[PDB]
Design a protein around this ligand. Structure first.
Ligand SMILES: [Mg+2]
Ligand SMILES: [Mg+2]
Ligand SMILES: [Mg+2]
Ligand SMILES: [Mg+2]
Ligand SMILES: [Mg+2]
Ligand SMILES: [Mg+2]
Ligand SMILES: [Mg+2]
Ligand SMILES: [Mg+2]
Ligand SMILES: [Mg+2]
Ligand SMILES: [Mg+2]
Ligand SMILES: [Mg+2]
Ligand SMILES: [Mg+2]
Ligand SMILES: [Mg+2]
Ligand SMILES: [Mg+2]
Ligand SMILES: [Mg+2]
Ligand SMILES: [Mg+2]
Lengths: 115, 39
RNA sequence: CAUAUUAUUAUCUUAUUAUUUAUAUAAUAUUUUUUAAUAAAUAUUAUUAAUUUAUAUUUAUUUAUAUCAGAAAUAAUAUGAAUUAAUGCGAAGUUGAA
RNA sequence: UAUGAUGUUGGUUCAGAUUAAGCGCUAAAUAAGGACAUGACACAUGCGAAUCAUACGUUUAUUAUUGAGAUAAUAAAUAUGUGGUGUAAACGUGAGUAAUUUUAUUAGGAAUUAAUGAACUAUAGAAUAAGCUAAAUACUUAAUAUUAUAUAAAAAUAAUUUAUAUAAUAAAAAGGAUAUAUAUAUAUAUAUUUAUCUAUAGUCAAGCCAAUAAUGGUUUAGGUAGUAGGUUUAUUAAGAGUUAAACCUAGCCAACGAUCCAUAAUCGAUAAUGAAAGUUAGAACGAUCACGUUGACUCUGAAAUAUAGUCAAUA
């Protein structure tokens, strides 16, 4: 994270049940103040799955809603995503491995796009 | 005292303007609305 | 009659600051005229530190204007007041006959 | 609820919902949402802004070469020395403020806002010399790198824009960390890293003005002399009596309420209520402004009368 424009997560919800708002915001402004744009939402809690479903083969899913075309516009301009936003966008395929870090093998499931 | 001289200048200007307004009230040739001009 | 706070000013005082005047054997840099100490070579010749000198950058001193804030005067905004005006209520009644 | 009874006018009260709530009595567990509205009254105590050793310096220990030290390699220590970045935000508050710069709205404007980037993006380039610091990426001095003219062209024209050619733009910088390669510990030369400076554009941002609305008292009725307007000058990136100077004109506001006084931060896709128009609040969520004990000024900076600095006031 650096620069004036940053793509971050703003905390919404209630105590002990966070949800997050993927926003484009000024660095110098407050975390929960109204941002430049609201690119999406991110619900951190995985969807619970039945013990049976663990055996069947499905995994918990985390729900992210995002504007793919607009996030490309903001990344192009030089808005600097944060570490968590970097992780989210990199899984989405928006960001490639150039954004990986040393701190961060096999692929059970490759990324797939569907309607 | 520059304040005193400035105040005197302001006063002179103001009284000049009030005299101008008072004499401008009677500067207009006021005909008789009843009887028209004198002749 | 007494206390309090904002506001202003042809008044008094003024921190600091901003411009603005003038003065510096006043400084610092460079430019001259010069004086000492030091080096190299066969009388020196240049070098540093000081002497005078005239351009900048400031310091001290002053001239003027404005200026925080203080008084003094006025006004208001309030707060209290002996003295004092009116009226409201109620107790059972008292007096007139409007 | 009048009335001896009737009809009507007329007030008073009640039924409903709510709260930034308080109090009386009473009270089990859990989940969530809030919590000094009053004295912007005063404050004990502890915390809330640090970080960088890969900027410069210091200080050790071992090994090697040199002879008390000197120089390298490797380990460390050093944020009480010199430096870089950060505190214009966020947090809290609602004193001031009735608009002279505040709030809300507009598919609103120009002066037709700067050779401003503040901190990232994409591109090119450059990174020189001295001095002073003990040394430097600290400071100074110096080197090199849009606007105004003149010619035309047009039209979105009685100006702007375009292109050209000149003038000045002309304004900078900084190295550290590793490796290696040369040669003669000394320099030097490349590469990798992380910095530095300039330029174009993008993004994020700023400054200014307009129109409409924004509480009560006229038992506050006249107010205003920079006052209202014009012309110049200084200042600003930029208009304007905004501030300072000069000279002209006599205007401007006002019974559809000026000026003055009192009170108040303002608002919403927020909260309460109603059938609705509306009315109330502005706690909580969010937006804007103001302030950080009080007043004025100054430096830096693009942006500050800064929670900075100076001066004064209070304690
Ligand atoms: Mg009765
Ligand atoms: Mg709770
Ligand atoms: Mg309070
Ligand atoms: Mg070191
Ligand atoms: Mg230090
Ligand atoms: Mg602030
Ligand atoms: Mg530098
Ligand atoms: Mg005026
Ligand atoms: Mg108030
Ligand atoms: Mg109100
Ligand atoms: Mg307030
Ligand atoms: Mg609120
Ligand atoms: Mg509160
Ligand atoms: Mg302030
Ligand atoms: Mg306090
Ligand atoms: Mg203050």
């Amino acid at each position: 994270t650096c620069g004036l424009v940053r793509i971050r997560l703003a905390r919404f919800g209630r105590k002990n049940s966070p949800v997050y708002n993927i926003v484009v915001a000024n660095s110098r402004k407050a975390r929960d103040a109204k941002p430049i744009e609201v690119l999406g939402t991110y619900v951190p809690v995985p969807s619970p799955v039945t013990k049976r479903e663990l055996k069947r083969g499905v995994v918990p899913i985390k729900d992210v809603k995002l504007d793919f075309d607009r996030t490309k516009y903001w990344i192009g301009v030089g808005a600097q995503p944060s570490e968590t936003v970097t992780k989210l966008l990199r899984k989405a395929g928006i960001l490639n491995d150039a954004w990986a870090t040393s701190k961060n093998r096999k692929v059970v499931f490759e990324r797939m796009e569907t309607l | 005292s520059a304040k005193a001289v400035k105040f005197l200048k302001a006063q002179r200007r103001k009284q000049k303007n009030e005299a101008k307004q008072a004499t401008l009230k009677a500067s207009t040739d006021k005909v008789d609305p009843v009887l028209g001009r004198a002749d």
